[PDB]
Every structure is written in structure tokens, then in C-alpha cells.
Design a protein around this ligand. Structure first.
Ligand SMILES: Nc1ncnc2c1ncn2[C@@H]1O[C@H](COP(=O)(O)OP(=O)(O)OP(=O)(O)O)[C@@H](O)[C@H]1O
Ligand SMILES: Nc1ncnc2c1ncn2[C@@H]1O[C@H](COP(=O)(O)OP(=O)(O)OP(=O)(O)O)[C@@H](O)[C@H]1O
Ligand SMILES: Nc1ncnc2c1ncn2[C@@H]1O[C@H](COP(=O)(O)OP(=O)(O)OP(=O)(O)O)[C@@H](O)[C@H]1O
Ligand SMILES: [K+]
Ligand SMILES: [K+]
Ligand SMILES: [K+]
Ligand SMILES: [Mg+2]
Ligand SMILES: [Mg+2]
Ligand SMILES: [Mg+2]
Lengths: 525, 525, 525
């Protein structure tokens, strides 16, 4: 259709207005004193939230160009979310800060490309510096603290997460479900859990959790790669009857075969999901067997001259339920008999005795623990369905944040880490003045998170910012108590990963907008 | 419906306005300092590009007449693209330059036909002169340089392309696919690859790549032309069963038979694709056999009194996958047994020994290399899906440009080649004054590319243009470093083919517009 | 619906405005210096043409009455086109000239009927006078010249046409197809070709060429007229099987039978086309046999007591392909065996020996030549698909014009023939003054073609017209070189047939408009 086309400044003011509406709506929810945002619903009462992502999803503007600016920066939160699962609001205020000053510099006549280069250089060095300052979240105490902090100071949620990770390990699978009513519940189910997700989406039958769930399915344990569907045809049909879904746990399911499975299960033609076998090399085969012993199946390896074509429903393993995430497979309640299973345990138990290497020893103990990984399930307390659904949300977020914290060290929260980094880069320079302005734009935007947190408290941003910059190290402002102190000692930490991600995605989208010269959209008609 | 009709000047100003909107939007993306253009999307964030073609595709104007002018010049980029696969932006700025001055001359009262004749004469001589200045891109170093330059100075992409061409030859087939994650991968697959594309589109089942892809298909190796479908009927039905696609590799598939295949495979009635046999004359038969030995098929030649009717699925060859472009067929992983294949190699290996001619020797070595051409596959590095998808784009373009460079010599880039050519034509004259003005219009437009590249840098076009014209030879302006020097020594080259194409298509469309007296379009209703 | 009704002058000015828009758009394309007209397309770039018919097809006006005038005169071009296949633009400028002055005379109070009578008388005498001046286009040199002139001075196209007519005779069938690429190709295919077209349209399966094309069809050779479908029923069903089309070559297919064939083949119920047998009388039977010997069929004549009912697929002849125009049937590649065919040739070859009459001798040689007419196929050169498609158009038009030239003598081109004729009619008078004005209107309009050709050159119409009228004979203005001279010696000729047709259709439609008193059209609602 006929288009409306805008250039330079005309386009810039439109974009800026669009990012401001989005960022302003989102940033009021930042930190312990975040404010509420009410989102209208077509039916019933409006939604009241302090969740940034929830607000962003609702933002769409009337002016086509302003809407483009809003949808562009909205990409910042979504990418930061996909990558770290937290810090989307932080990423959004960093982006607004960089875009605002960057566009001002452009309007002033500065070279957009140089501005972007300067911003990029500052971010590159800032990230290195962020790593240098990064400390860990390994022990259960740290995990508890981060969990508590991520749960709005709810020490309860903190303990839960810590206990759940103590059961299945901090790398294990953990889920949260509605509670039976009052008092939380934590139980490990099959069963076993290993680090391997679906070999492709679509298998996802429950987009609510973005996971795949199968009930009383058959489990094919093939010790090899599967490229040709032909091999599956015989077993797939055997499973076609008995009306039960099939879980493929092979060394890997490549294009040809995988593509077919995706299409067939897409047409209701037999429900089948595929995931890679745990581990690699030798231990892979040994582990693929542990699953067999657990599900009562039989490994189909070519090493013993076995063919998938010559595989009956008797070779297949089976369990009451199996769940698979983007990167986790959990088999709940397997058919395997305690005789075989417990016997398998005894075997591996001796393996540990004959262990001549710590590495081999560790790997073996990992198997016995799993067989004797599973899935830790957290059932949220209650006392009224409303509160129960709420606490469930908090536990979910706290878990998500703590998981991120465990993966990559931690740094002082409350926006102080970025402020310390910015101060260390005061002498950073580029190839020219415009690049230097870009560097300064980035260092200035690095104070935005702390300033917005303070602003949401009802305090003065410049005063608090000035005071924090005055000290050093982990010295920061505790917005919950409105007292200065050592952020680490007060338990206010952020996973280095979310801080880094927030900054990189903010600078990335900001750089693109700053170097945008023209915009095209449908004519308002 | 009722039409709006415009004549002369009224039509001219409309056309000019339409080409200006398109050219201005496109030309800002020219060269190393090209600016970004933001293209609106109905959903999500806007597209940000420095790619001229991407911008042109989005240009459509409200005023019916202006839109006609935009769509007309848009033909310049598309034809230059189809012919050389690069230089569409260059072609667009040349067209705008020729159209602008040409229409001004017309408004001044000059004869349109003479103006066009003059422009044509200048372009004819300019092309001859361009050939005279043309130098080569034969060795891997040159290929690497061009690749690097086409990849925005990414020496990585440069090395990749150079290595890929070193594997399958600079005339061989090369593809790029998403990487497994971090670090690039280069592997040659079946298999073999020969220079023959689909005998007609439609066979193209994947318009994304504009190629045809078949999985585990049967390969009919007929040593003769196929005109009558009757001959195929028996084999086509044999292939109808077993549910596998068919690849026809005959001496040629003419109208009657071809037309049927296009219609049938068009109705899902058996998937079949046809391509000519590699080479011609004697070597053709020998090569058609190499394919047989590779795919485990049997050549059906009339020389041995064989009929296609009397051909079973046992005579047909077979491979896990085959891909065919506009002019390349690649058979990946053939059923042929290493015994037969490796034996065939030994045969041809002796052929080379008994070779009494270099030509026959070269041709034989070509066969052994292919059997012992295939398809080089480039898997782009990664480190996040976003960057991976981006680098993939660059490798694709760099490859496309380097391929063009390899085909036809090279000339100084940065728009200097056309400037040198223009200076050599200062004394060119026509049959009259109007023809002389046309010649001058063309020589003036030849400076436009260098001027726009400089303008995009933020420098002064006239000053740089003046300085480059001041020197001679490969003396030019390096827009990346903003330093003058020897364009060739700095590695800034353009395939003579893209420069020539850009100029000819620009002059061609410009000539048509300049000689347009009337425009007809639907009434804005 | 409610109508708008206009009378006399009100209607006249509307008509005149409508013919002026159409004629003005069309006439700029007249002659060697014709200008371009740009025609808008709903998708892609506009069409740029110098072809009058192409422009006329696009002309439709908003004002209902003006549109009526445009559509009426548009009938001039279309009829001239159908009758001579050239001179549509010439016919259009003659019509505008006659209509313009004629309507002015009417407005002045002159009797419309007398004006029309005068115009008619002038045209009647002018045509006689045109015949008197008419010279021939018989030898290949003349054919080459006309072809070159009709191909915009492209001596290449001229040679092609000349060679094609040298192969199949100037009365033979000639077609043009896309070339294989670079360099033209001329080959005679079956086969044989005779002067007989489809016995009715509808059989036309390819409206693009307005011809009928059959592949591997059966050929019924009945030596008699076919009125009753009953006779065909048995053979039609035999042909229903084997899934092959049928070509009926009988003495003639009359109403009843023909009507059925048209209806059945109209419903996909068996594809059958019918054409009369070549020649008449005795030679007819002999010729019908030559076709049999060529297609391997059997003539079904009642003379030998044969019935169509008792005719099997074995009696029917057969060929790989057959094409039939409005007045030409060409059988390509017949099944007949070279033994029978070459033997038949020997027979007729002796016939020529025993020939006691030149007439019988000529007729026999015609048969041997055909059997030892066919269809000459011209494959246009190339060097890029665009240029190839263009040159193909030129060859098509040049062929069409040359064919017309060959049929009926030639006269000086460049509009001089009509000017010479007009000068010879200076003393022509009618029954009254109004009739005399009508005569003058017609003689004045006869200068219009030369004047428009000159005007398109950018020269002065009155000066050139005055100078040409000053000399005599073939003295004219060469618009290509802008030099006066002998039109015939310069090779600028027009078939007398197209000039005559252009004038008669122009005067015919003009006469109708001039005698129109009232117009009725739907109310603009
Ligand atoms: N007591 C506190 N004092 C100061 N800052 C705190 C305190 N508790 C938490 N924070 C900080 O608040 C920030 C996180 O706030 P919040 O969860 O509202 O936004 P986000 O994580 O950036 O985005 P999302 O909407 O995805 O949660 C981090 O900088 C965190 O360290
Ligand atoms: N360092 C450089 N200095 C000057 N010119 C350069 C430099 N590097 C590349 N170029 C030139 O830039 C031009 C190519 O730019 P670009 O790829 O943006 O446009 P294009 O090829 O004309 O069209 P497309 O949009 O199809 O790519 C060529 O003239 C090339 O030689
Ligand atoms: N060198 C020439 N000088 C003068 N007149 C020429 C010359 N070459 C061709 N002509 C004339 O130009 C006329 C034909 O022009 P043109 O083909 O443009 O129009 P047309 O045949 O009247 O209509 P159509 O659009 O059907 O072709 C004829 O009168 C022909 O003799
Ligand atoms: K919040
Ligand atoms: K570019
Ligand atoms: K013309
Ligand atoms: Mg958070
Ligand atoms: Mg390019
Ligand atoms: Mg003509």
C-alpha cells in the first residue's frame, strides 16, 4: 500500500517519542520500590503489575512511526529476557538513556557512525571490566540470599529454591506447581532427569510452559544417530497401536528423520518427541543403559548388530510421565523393576570403589545419585487461591533469577556494579571527538539503573548517585531500607550474566536506532 | 477503468520525482560508510539495512505517476542484480544521474532521441574502454582480497571463500548454511557436482534458495535426448511406487517430455527434476558413466540398443540427496560402492598416464577429482543466533561478489574506474549538439558513484572527485580509511562485470525514460 | 438505466474531443522518428512503446461521450489491422484529419450527408488512382528491402525474411520463435505445409498465436465432404482411446458435423480440428494422397466404396506435431516411411517429365517441393533475454508488413503516395458545393500522414509538404536521413494494400461520425 516515508530528524523525533512512552511505562516498575502499572483487560478487572515484561507486551502506539520506535526498543527487553531471563527493565532504561543522549548528539551534528562506534567501544571495555569485578553463587547460603532478594525479601521462597537445588543439584531440573493448600511441598520425581531438551520446538504440546509432556509413553533407547525414517517405520507403527506416545532417546535425530517426526506429530499422526542421549563418548552408552534399567527398556546399539526395524514394543522402555524443556528431559516413574534398578545401583557403586581417578569417580557418583537426575517439584503454599497463584509467580521468578545467578558470578546489585564500571572508564577515548561523545553517552547511561531505582523510592537520584560514586567497591544504596552500605553484605546481588546482557542488548538496539536515517510505514489509512 | 493521462513536461516532473525518492532512499547505503535505512514491518521491530536491494523492494509511492517513475528505475537494480548479482546501488545512482540531467536537457528544448543516442554512444565506447582497463581475480590471494572487501573488511569471510573455491574450484558449487555454533565449518559433500542446472524453474521446490532439493531420489542416467513421454511412462510408474523422487540426467529433455514433467510434478504427481548431462560429445558419455558408478546406476544408451521402456528401478542410480541451482547439480552421498567407484578412479588414473595431450590430460584429472565435483558447504560461525544469521548474510554476499569477480577481470573500485573511463572520453562527439550534450550527460553521471561514496563518508564530493581526477591510473580515494592511494594495492576492486552491467542497465532505463512522451495510469479512485 | 442523450453540436464536440485524445496519443509514434508513449501497468515498470496499436488498446476516457468518440475511431485501426496488418497509425491520423475538418464543416452549416458523399467520392477515385500508381515486391531483393525498412532499417531482419520466403515460397508459412541464444536460425519443418486454415476458430487452443497446435495427433484423410457426425462416431471413439488428438483433412466439414466438433472439443471431449483439403478438382485428390504418403495414412474416398464408419486407427495418418493458422496448415514430422515418401517423389518426378503443359508442370513441381510445403521457422538471435524478446517483435512486424507487400504492389512510402494521389484529384467535383467541400476535406487529410511523420522528426510539416508537392513521382522526404530524394530508390515503400486499407477504413468511420446526430449513454452514476 502507499507508504509514509520519513528522514533524519523527522524520523528521529518520532522514534524518540515512541521509545520514551515505552521506557517510561516500564521503568516505574524497577526495583524494590517499583510502582504499579494498571493494564486494561477487555473483561473483568484490570491487571495490576510491577513486572516490566508484562507492561512492555501491552505497549503499541497510534502514530505509526512512534510505534516503530517502541517496537524496536521492545526488542531489547525480549532479547535480554531470552538470554538471561531477568533484567529486562534494567535493559530498557539503559537503552532509553543511550538512545536519548545519542539522538541528541546526532541532532547536534555529530557523526552517527562514530557515536555508535564510541558506544560500542565503551560497552566492550565495560563488559571486560564487569568480568573483572565479578565474584560466585555456589553455596546454598548464597543461593538462598539471591532467591530471597529475587522474591522481594521473602526468605521463604529463598529457602525453597535452596532446598530444591540441594536435592537435584544447582544444574538439575526444577519446576513449580500450584500447591494442595497452605504449606509448601518439595518432592523429587522421575525417576531421573538429564540435561537434554527437545530436538526442536513443535514437540512442545504445552506452550504455557514451553515444554513437552507425555503420559505413559514408550521410550526408544537407540544407541546411534537416526537419519532415515525407514528404520523407525516398524517401531512407530507398533507404537501406533496401544495408543501411546513415543519418546526417542537416540545419540541424535538428524534432519531427514527429525523433519518427518515434526510433520507427523504435527498432524496428530502418532505423538513422538526426540531428545539426544545424555553425555557423550563412552559414558554416553553407560548412561543410556541406566535409562533402560530405569524404564525397563532395551538399548538398540549397532555394536551388537541390532536393528531398529527388528525392534518390538517389548524392547521399548516405559514410564508414567516424561517432561522435556528447552534443555532438560525428566522421566517420571519408570516401569523398570526395583530389582534391576537397585542392582544396577550396586554395580555402579562398586565402579566407584575401583575408581582410580577422581573424574571417573565423580561421573559415577552422578549416575548413582540420578538412578537412586529426576525433577524436583516445588508446590507453592496457599491459604486462598489468589495468594497461592501470586506466591507461585514469585517463586517462578526468584527461581529463574537464582538459576541465572548460579551460572555466571555475581556483582553488587542496585545498579552499583555499572556505576563502578563507568567510573573505571573515565579515561577511555576513541579515534575522534564524536567517538569520545559516544563513549560518554554510554558511561552516562550506566548510571540510569541506580537513578531510576532511587527515583522510584521517592528519593533524589543525583544525591544518591553522587554519594555512591563517592565511595567505592561494593558501597551502594539499599533502596529497601533507604540506607547506604556494602551491597554484598546486605545481600543485594545481581548475576553478572543479567547485568552484562542488559547492557549489551541495550547498546545493540540503541546503536541501530542512532544509525537509522529513514523510516517507512503504511500510510495511516 | 477511467485513466489519467499526462504528456511531456507534466509527465517528466512526475517521473523525476519518483526516481528521486527511490534513488535517494537507496543511495545512502552506498559504500563502506553507507548509512542505515529503517524499513517498517507490520509486526515487531523495524528492519535496519545497508542493503540497497532491500530498500528498493519497499519503495512504492502514492502519486500514481511518481510511482511509475520509481517502479521503472527499480528495473535497473533488478536487472543489474540478475546479471551480476552486485552493484545494484551503483546502477541506481548512475541511472538517477543520467535521468536527472537528461530530463533537464529535454526541458531545455533538446531533442530526446538525440540525447539518448549520445548517451548510448558514450556508454558503448565507455564499455570498450572499461575492458581495456580491466586487469583478473584468479589466484586465491586475489579471491581472498575481493572476498574480504565484499565482506566489509572481514578477512575471515575472505579466507573462507578462498578455501571453499580451493576445494571445489572457483567454478565449483558453493553453499552457505547456518553453523552448529561458534567457529566456521567447510566440508565437501556429494558425492559430485557438475555444471548443469534445472531444465526449467518450477522444479524449484525451495524458492528461498531458488533451487531444487530431492531426498533419497532415484537417478535415471539416459544417454540420449528425451522428447516423448511414452519412454518415461514405464520407469516413472516404477518410481511412482517406493515413494521416492526421480532425477533425470539425460543428454537433454525437450519440450514434449519436459512440459509433461513440469505439469505432473506440479500436481504432486511424482516428484521429478531434469538436468542436462555434463559436458558434450565424447567426454559426455564417459562422464555420464562416472555418475552411474557413483550412484550405482546404469547408463541407458541407444548405442547398446537399450530402451527406457525396458528400464527397472534396478537400473536407476540413487543418492541420499541432490541439489540443483540455475546452473549447478550436486549429488550428495551416492549408493555406488567404494569398490566400483575407487576402481573407476584407478581406470581414469591410467587414462592420465596414457594421455598424449594436455587437453585430454586436464579433462581426465577433472573427472578423477570430482569422483575422488560435489558441493563445498560453508557453515557460518556463531556465538548467538543473531550474529550467526548476520555473518551468514555477509558470507552470502561476499561469495556472490567474489564469484562475479572471478568470472570477468577487475578494475579499481570506489568508483574510480568509471571516472578514469570518463576522462578518456572527453573528446567523444556525436552527430550534433544535442547528441554531444547526451554524451556529456553520460560522462558526468559516471562520477556519481564516487561522489555518493564520499558524500556518505561525510566528506566533500567535489574536492575528492577533483583530487582523484587529478591523478591517474589506480589512484583513488579509500573511503574506509579516508586516505588516497592505489586502489588495487589497497585491495579495493570491483569485478569489471558488475561495473559494466551497472552502467549499461542504468543507461538503458534512463534512455527509455528520457524518450517517454506520455504516461497512462488509473485515476486515483 | 437512465440515459444521458446528446444532439448535434453538443454530441459533436464530445466526439471530436474523444477522437483527438486517442489520435494524438497514437500519432506521435508514426514513422522512423516516432516518439515513445509510456503505458502504465498495475505491477512493475511501465511499458514503453512506439507501436500504435499498443497505445490505442489502452485508451478509454472518463467522459462517457468522449469515450464513445475514442472507441469509434479505434475501430479504424482495428479494421485496418485485421485487413492489412499494418498502417493502423496511418489510418488513425487520416481519420482524425477527415473527422476534424468534416465536423468543422458541419458546424459551419454544411449538409452532413453531402459532406460524406463528397468524401466517399474522393476516396473511390483516390483508390483507383492508387492502383494506377502501384508498382511489385516479387524478387528477394525487394522483399529484403521492405523487410529491412519494416524492421527499422535492420538489414539483418530483412535478410532473414527474404531467406525464409526463399525456402517455403513467398506464399508459404513462416513463424518466429525465441532463439537458442545469439545468432539466428532458419529451418523448415513438417513435413509439409498447405494453404488451408482451421474451418472455424475455437479450435484455436493457443490464442497467443491465434492458431491451433496438436501434438502426436492422428490424421484422418477423407476424400469427401462430411455433413453427418454419424460417419465420424466410429473413428472418433477409436481416437478417444490412445489419448491422441485428431486432425480432419476432408474435402470440407459442413455445419452439422463441424458444429458438433466445435462443441465436443469445446468440452474437452476429444481434441479434434478440421481443415479443407489443399487445392480443388483433380489435383485435390492427388495432393490429399501426398499427405497420406507423408503421414502414413490412408485416403478414405467413396470412389473406392470406402466408409468412414469402417475406418480404424490404422487408416489414420500421424505426425509429431501440426499447426494451423487462419489460413495455413503445417504438418511437422510425419510417420510416413522415407521409402514410401521418396518413392512418391520419384513418381511425381516422372509426372513432370511426361508433362505436356507448363501449368501441369508447375503444379507437379509444387508437390515434389512440398513433399521433398512445410513451415519455415525463424529463431531470433539473442545475447540477453531482453534484446532477444525485442528483436523477435521486430521480426514479427517486419514479416507481417513484408507479407502484405508481397500480396499487393507497392507505392512510395513516407506518405508521398497519398500526396501524389491528392494532387491528381484537384479538379474532382461533386453534385454541389457541400459535396465539393467534402472532396476537399478528403484531399487535405491525405497530406496528414506525411505531415505527422515530419512533425515527429522535429521538422516543419508545411515546408516539407510544400517541397514534396513541388516535385512529382517518387520524389519524397526521407525522414530517417532528413534528405529529399526518390523514395523507391531509397527503399521506402508501402504495400499498396495497407495504404488503400488505411484510407478506406479512415473514410468509412469518419463518414459515420460526420453523419451522427445523436448519442446515447448511461448516466455517469
Ligand atoms: N534492596 C535493594 N536495593 C537496591 N536495589 C535492589 C534491591 N533489591 C533489588 N535491587 C535491584 O533491583 C534491580 C532489579 O529490579 P527488577 O526486578 O524490578 O527489574 P529487572 O530485573 O531489571 O527487570 P524485570 O522486569 O525483568 O524483573 C537489580 O538492579 C537489583 O539488584
Ligand atoms: N574502502 C573503500 N573505499 C572506497 N570504495 C570502496 C571501499 N570498499 C568498497 N568500495 C566500493 O563501494 C562500492 C560497492 O558498495 P555497495 O556494496 O554498498 O553497493 P553496490 O554493490 O553498488 O550495490 P548493492 O546494494 O547491490 O551492494 C564499489 O564501488 C566498491 O569498490
Ligand atoms: N525513412 C523513412 N522516411 C519516411 N517515411 C518512412 C521511412 N521509413 C518508413 N516510413 C513510413 O512510415 C510509415 C509507417 O510508420 P509506422 O510503422 O510507424 O506506422 P503504421 O504502419 O501507419 O501503423 P502501425 O502502428 O500499425 O505500424 C509508412 O508511411 C512508411 O513508408
Ligand atoms: K519489578
Ligand atoms: K551497501
Ligand atoms: K511506429
Ligand atoms: Mg527482575
Ligand atoms: Mg555490493
Ligand atoms: Mg507499421
Amino acid at each position: 500500500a502507499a507508504k509514509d516515508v520519513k528522514f533524519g530528524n523527522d524520523a528521529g523525533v518520532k522514534m524518540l517519542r515512541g521509545v520514551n512512552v515505552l521506557a517510561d511505562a516500564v521503568k516505574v516498575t524497577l526495583g524494590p520500590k517499583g510502582r504499579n502499572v494498571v493494564l486494561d483487560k477487555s473483561f473483568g478487572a484490570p491487571t495490576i503489575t510491577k513486572d516490566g515484561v508484562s507492561v512492555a507486551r501491552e505497549i503499541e502506539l497510534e502514530d505509526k512511526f512512534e510505534n516503530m520506535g517502541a517496537q524496536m526498543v521492545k526488542e531489547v527487553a525480549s532479547k535480554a529476557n531470552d538470554a538471561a531471563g531477568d533484567g529486562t527493565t534494567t535493559a530498557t532504561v539503559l537503552a532509553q538513556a543511550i538512545i536519548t543522549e545519542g539522538l541528541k548528539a546526532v541532532a547536534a551534528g555529530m557523526n552517527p557512525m562514530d557515536l555508535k562506534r564510541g558506544i560500542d567501544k565503551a560497552v566492550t571495555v565495560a563488559v571486560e571490566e564487569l568480568k573483572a569485578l565479578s565474584v560466585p553463587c555456589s553455596d546454598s547460603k548464597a543461593i538462598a540470599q539471591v532467591g530471597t532478594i529475587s522474591a522481594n525479601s521473602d526468605e521463604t521462597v529463598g529457602k525453597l529454591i535452596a532446598e530444591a537445588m540441594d536435592k537435584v543439584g544447582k544444574e538439575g531440573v526444577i519446576t513449580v506447581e500450584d500447591g494442595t493448600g497452605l504449606q509448601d511441598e518439595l518432592d523429587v520425581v522421575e525417576g531421573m532427569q538429564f540435561d537434554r531438551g527437545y530436538l526442536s520446538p513443535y514437540f512442545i504440546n504445552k506452550p504455557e510452559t514451553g515444554a513437552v509432556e507425555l503420559e505413559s509413553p514408550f521410550i526408544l533407547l537407540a544407541d546411534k544417530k537416526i537419519s532415515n525414517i525407514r528404520e523407525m517405520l516398524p517401531v512407530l507403527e507398533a507404537v501406533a497401536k496401544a495408543g501411546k506416545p513415543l519418546l526417542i532417546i537416540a545419540e541424535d535425530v538428524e534432519g531427514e528423520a527429525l523433519a518427518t517426526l515434526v510433520v507427523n506429530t504435527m498432524r496428530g499422526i502418532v505423538k513422538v518427541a526426540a531428545v539426544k542421549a545424555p553425555g557423550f563418548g563412552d559414558r554416553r552408552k553407560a548412561m543410556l543403559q541406566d535409562i533402560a534399567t530405569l524404564t525397563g527398556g532395551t538399548v538398540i546399539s549397532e555394536e551388537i548388530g541390532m536393528e531398529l526395524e527388528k525392534a518390538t514394543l517389548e524392547d521399548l522402555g516405559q514410564a508414567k510421565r516424561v517432561v522435556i524443556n528447552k534443555d532438560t528431559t525428566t522421566i517420571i516413574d519408570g516401569v523398570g523393576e526395583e530389582a534391576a534398578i537397585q542392582g544396577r545401583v550396586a554395580q555402579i557403586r562398586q565402579q566407584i570403589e575401583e575408581a582410580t581417578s577422581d573424574y571417573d569417580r565423580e561421573k559415577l557418583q552422578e549416575r548413582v545419585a540420578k538412578l537412586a537426575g529426576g525433577v524436583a517439584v516445588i508446590k507453592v503454599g496457599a491459604a486462598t487461591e489468589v495468594e497461592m497463584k501470586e506466591k507461585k509467580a514469585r517463586v517462578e521468578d526468584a527461581l529463574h533469577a537464582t538459576r541465572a545467578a548460579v551460572e555466571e558470578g555475581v556483582v553488587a546489585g542496585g545498579g552499583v556494579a555499572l556505576i563502578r564500571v563507568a567510573s573505571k572508564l573515565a579515561d577511555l577515548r576513541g579515534q575522534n571527538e564524536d567517538q569520545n561523545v559516544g563513549i560518554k553517552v554510554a558511561l552516562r547511561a550506566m548510571e540510569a539503573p541506580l537513578r531510576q531505582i532511587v527515583l522510584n523510592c521517592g528519593e533524589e537520584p543525583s544525591v544518591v548517585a553522587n554519594t555512591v560514586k563517592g565511595g567505592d567497591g561494593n558501597y551502594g544504596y539499599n533502596a529497601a531500607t533507604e540506607e547506604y552500605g556494602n551491597m554484598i553484605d546486605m545481600g543485594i546481588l545481581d548475576p553478572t550474566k543479567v547485568t552484562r546482557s542488559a547492557l549489551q542488548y541495550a547498546a545493540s538496539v540503541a546503536g541501530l536506532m542512532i544509525t537509522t536515517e529513514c523510516m517507512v510505514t503504511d500510510l495511516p489509512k
